[PDB]
Design an enzyme around this catalytic site. Structure first.
Site, PDB file in Angstrom:
ATOM      1  N   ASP A   1      -5.276   8.979  14.124  1.00  0.00           N
ATOM      2  CA  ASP A   1      -5.359   8.885  12.727  1.00  0.00           C
ATOM      3  C   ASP A   1      -6.379   6.693  12.993  1.00  0.00           C
ATOM      4  OD1 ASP A   1      -5.242   8.041  10.040  1.00  0.00           O
ATOM      5  OD2 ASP A   1      -3.069   8.033   9.827  1.00  0.00           O
TER       6      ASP A   1
ATOM      7  N   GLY B   1       0.571  -1.230  -0.299  1.00  0.00           N
ATOM      8  CA  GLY B   1       0.030   0.306  -0.006  1.00  0.00           C
ATOM      9  C   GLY B   1       0.723   1.143   0.019  1.00  0.00           C
TER      10      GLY B   1
ATOM     11  N   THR C   1       5.019   4.078   0.575  1.00  0.00           N
ATOM     12  CA  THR C   1       4.402   2.472   0.246  1.00  0.00           C
ATOM     13  C   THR C   1       5.014   2.199   1.055  1.00  0.00           C
ATOM     14  OG1 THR C   1       7.648   2.494  -0.720  1.00  0.00           O
ATOM     15  CG2 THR C   1       4.859   3.290  -2.847  1.00  0.00           C
ATOM     16  N   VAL C   2       4.057   0.876   1.405  1.00  0.00           N
ATOM     17  CA  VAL C   2       4.270  -0.190   2.647  1.00  0.00           C
ATOM     18  C   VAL C   2       4.758  -1.452   1.662  1.00  0.00           C
ATOM     19  CG1 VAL C   2       3.638  -1.497   3.880  1.00  0.00           C
ATOM     20  CG2 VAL C   2       2.621   0.709   4.391  1.00  0.00           C
TER      21      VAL C   2
ATOM     22  N   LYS D   1       7.689   0.404   5.638  1.00  0.00           N
ATOM     23  CA  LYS D   1       7.664   2.014   5.464  1.00  0.00           C
ATOM     24  C   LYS D   1       8.201   2.465   4.581  1.00  0.00           C
ATOM     25  CE  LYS D   1       3.981   5.613   7.479  1.00  0.00           C
ATOM     26  NZ  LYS D   1       3.029   5.595   8.157  1.00  0.00           N
TER      27      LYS D   1
HETATM   28  C1  LIG Z   1      -2.293  -8.179   2.755  1.00  0.00           C
HETATM   29  N1  LIG Z   1      -1.626  -6.508   4.083  1.00  0.00           N
HETATM   30  C2  LIG Z   1      -0.675  -6.534   4.664  1.00  0.00           C
HETATM   31  C3  LIG Z   1      -0.936  -4.964   5.023  1.00  0.00           C
HETATM   32  C4  LIG Z   1      -0.327  -4.857   6.060  1.00  0.00           C
HETATM   33  C5  LIG Z   1       0.801  -3.542   6.461  1.00  0.00           C
HETATM   34  C6  LIG Z   1       1.399  -3.304   7.287  1.00  0.00           C
HETATM   35  C7  LIG Z   1       2.062  -2.651   8.182  1.00  0.00           C
HETATM   36  C8  LIG Z   1       2.766  -2.840   9.116  1.00  0.00           C
HETATM   37  C9  LIG Z   1       2.605  -4.440  10.054  1.00  0.00           C
HETATM   38  N2  LIG Z   1       1.678  -5.200   9.225  1.00  0.00           N
HETATM   39  C10 LIG Z   1       1.041  -4.588   8.078  1.00  0.00           C
HETATM   40  N3  LIG Z   1       0.609  -6.222   7.112  1.00  0.00           N
HETATM   41  C11 LIG Z   1      -1.508  -4.736   4.064  1.00  0.00           C
HETATM   42  C12 LIG Z   1      -2.078  -2.448   3.806  1.00  0.00           C
HETATM   43  C13 LIG Z   1      -2.582  -2.891   2.881  1.00  0.00           C
HETATM   44  C14 LIG Z   1      -2.997  -1.448   2.752  1.00  0.00           C
HETATM   45  O1  LIG Z   1      -3.782  -1.051   2.013  1.00  0.00           O
HETATM   46  N4  LIG Z   1      -2.140  -0.136   2.926  1.00  0.00           N
HETATM   47  C15 LIG Z   1      -2.703   1.215   2.639  1.00  0.00           C
HETATM   48  C16 LIG Z   1      -2.686   1.884   1.768  1.00  0.00           C
HETATM   49  C17 LIG Z   1      -3.867   1.942   3.331  1.00  0.00           C
HETATM   50  C18 LIG Z   1      -1.369   1.568   3.817  1.00  0.00           C
HETATM   51  O2  LIG Z   1      -1.659   3.260   3.614  1.00  0.00           O
HETATM   52  C19 LIG Z   1      -2.967  -3.643   1.819  1.00  0.00           C
HETATM   53  C20 LIG Z   1      -3.204  -5.134   2.133  1.00  0.00           C
HETATM   54  C21 LIG Z   1      -1.852  -5.135   3.196  1.00  0.00           C
END
Ligand SMILES: Cn1cc(-c2cc3cccnc3[nH]2)c2cc(C(=O)NC(C)(C)CO)ccc21
Length: 262
Positions: free
Chosen positions: A122, A16, A17-18, A35
């Site tokens: 948030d 998601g 950048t993540v 992140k």
């Molecule tokens: C399968 N999956 C796992 C994650 C995920 C992000 C994350 C961050 C920290 C710890 N665990 C995590 N798991 C995730 C985020 C997103 C996601 O859309 N994150 C946004 C764009 C809202 C962040 O701004 C979509 C799918 C995901």
């Protein structure tokens, strides 16, 4: 908390950048979410890590560390099911008791944050991450703040881009954020959860949401939503800060009802 870039593998597939990644630890790899950046935003990431560093709770996303490489990276343990809203969108089959279980967990995590004098700022279903279908963690401390020892609120000087539809009146009007405003936010989160990941105040501008709330109007009960859970949403959406419950009260309400229903 400074991690070795050599020991970190990043997928080029964006979450998601993540980004998903793997970090070679004490003896094993650990699956991590990362992140990644891109002067002003460097300090914000490092502040967010500084917040996370200080938190230790089962219902809060745990930070592994930070990493200086191609850019500044914040490295956290991966909750693999992703955001609660997307999950519920794709999984309408989840029983009310399962959603009750999950929101209660969020409230314990938020009670811990209230006890520690941190404001999230948030809180939304998008920043609730599922480890499993029966285990949720709070994430994204990008806007979070430690409260001064002498004050129960944080005062922003001018808004940025704010998640207005999750914000309590006092935040909008006076720029004041306390654990009670997180409580209002938690109400919207509960609404999002029982609506299976639907957007709140669909089609409305924030300004129109502010106007609606000022008239004593609130979102309607989601299809299938336990009446007591809708009652709790409304208690959370108490316009007056002083009579809105804290998380200690919200958690206890949620705990009691949850134990009553199982
Ligand atoms: C399968 N999956 C796992 C994650 C995920 C992000 C994350 C961050 C920290 C710890 N665990 C995590 N798991 C995730 C985020 C997103 C996601 O859309 N994150 C946004 C764009 C809202 C962040 O701004 C979509 C799918 C995901």
């Amino acid at each position: 908390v400074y991690l070795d870039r050599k020991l970190l593998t990043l997928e080029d597939k964006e979450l998601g950048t993540v980004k998903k990644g793997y970090y070679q630890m004490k003896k094993v790899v650990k699956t991590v979410a990362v992140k990644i950046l891109k002067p002003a935003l460097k300090d914000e990431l490092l502040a967010e890590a500084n917040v996370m560093q200080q938190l230790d709770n089962p219902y809060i996303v745990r930070m592994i560390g930070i990493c200086e490489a191609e850019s500044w990276m914040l490295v956290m343990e991966m909750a693999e099911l992703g955001p609660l809203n997307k999950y519920l969108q794709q999984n309408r089959h989840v029983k009310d008791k399962n959603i009750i279980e999950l929101v209660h967990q969020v409230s314990m995590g938020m009670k811990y944050l209230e006890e520690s004098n941190f404001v999230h700022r948030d809180l939304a279903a998008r920043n609730v991450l599922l480890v499993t279908q029966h285990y949720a963690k709070i994430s994204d401390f990008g806007l979070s703040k430690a409260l001064r020892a002498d004050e129960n609120y944080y005062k922003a000087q001018t808004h940025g881009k704010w998640p207005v539809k999750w914000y309590a009146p006092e935040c909008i009007n006076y720029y004041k954020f306390s654990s009670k405003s997180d409580v209002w936010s938690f109400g919207v989160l509960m609404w999002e959860a029982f609506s299976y990941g639907q957007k709140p105040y669909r089609g409305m501008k924030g300004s129109e949401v502010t106007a609606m709330l000022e008239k004593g109007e609130r979102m309607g009960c989601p299809a299938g939503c336990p009446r007591e859970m809708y009652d709790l949403m409304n208690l959370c959406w108490t316009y007056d800060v002083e009579n809105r419950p804290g998380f200690a009260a919200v958690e206890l309400r949620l705990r009691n009802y949850y134990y009553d229903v199982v």
